[PDB]
Design a protein around this ligand. Structure first.
Ligand SMILES: NCCC[C@H](N)C(=O)O
Length: 238
């Protein structure tokens, strides 16, 4: 008894995984994976755009049935929702102006302005580690606003998923004068282990269907065909 229509929420501001083209069509690797899996599940899927922090609220309120929005599988989210198996990996990394002295350390960030997406794992991390000790951490409704404030010079740095920053901004015309600032920030407690489809705990049948379709499209080479459309590296990880 899978549903006839599955409503999938995504934030649409996190290129190359989820965004809108010029006609307003939903595009990105997450969109591709979600439609490929829907097809294999033999269900209809509708995509619903939402701010990222309203997604897990909307899932529990049954406004949507699934989240595919580079949602990191963390210990803390697992207490509220369920996840499919890993769709791809995601480390976090800071970006700042090319030739910035900035490092991801309190010492370097004290009194700087750091943007983070509200509701993300980066916001939780920065609020605990940097905001309490006086780094001016600013939370934003969506990641696009962060890039704009950054190029505007309202922010000194931003913390987000490394591949989103690299392909969605640094390799774009607007990110030409910016670069990664220090190495990836690793913290098991905050960033979880890769991303997956977020689902209500009680929707067991739906989790099994997504996991099965994911196994199948990975086994027949589709995952790699789809990922070579965006990445020249192993996006899945281990
Ligand atoms: N769409 C925002 C994704 C950011 C980070 N992976 C998280 O799960 O919070």
């Amino acid at each position: 008894a899978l549903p006839q229509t599955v409503r999938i929420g995504t934030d649409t501001t996190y290129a190359p995984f989820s965004s809108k083209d010029a006609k307003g069509e939903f595009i990105g690797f997450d969109i591709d994976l979600g439609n490929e899996m829907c097809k294999r599940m033999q269900v209809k899927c509708t995509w619903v755009a939402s701010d990222f922090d309203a997604l897990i609220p909307s899932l529990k309120a049954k406004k949507i049935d699934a989240i595919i929005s580079s949602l990191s599988i963390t210990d803390k989210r697992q207490q509220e929702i369920a996840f499919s198996d890993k769709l791809y990996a995601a480390d976090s990394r800071l970006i700042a102006a090319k030739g910035s002295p900035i490092q991801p350390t309190l010492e370097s960030l004290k009194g700087k302005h750091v943007g983070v997406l509200q509701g993300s794992t980066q916001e939780a991390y920065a609020n605990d580690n940097w905001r309490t000790k006086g780094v001016d951490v600013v939370a934003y409704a969506n990641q696009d606003l962060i890039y704009s404030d950054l190029t505007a010079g309202r922010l000194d740095a931003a913390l987000q998923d490394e591949v989103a920053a690299s392909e969605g901004f640094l390799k774009q015309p607007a990110g030409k004068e910016y670069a990664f600032a220090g190495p990836s920030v690793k913290d098991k407690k905050y960033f979880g282990d890769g991303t997956g489809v977020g689902l209500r705990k009680d929707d067991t049948e739906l989790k099994a269907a997504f996991d099965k379709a994911l196994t199948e499209l990975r086994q027949d080479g589709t995952y790699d065909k789809m990922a070579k459309k965006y990445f020249d590296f192993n996006v899945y990880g281990d």
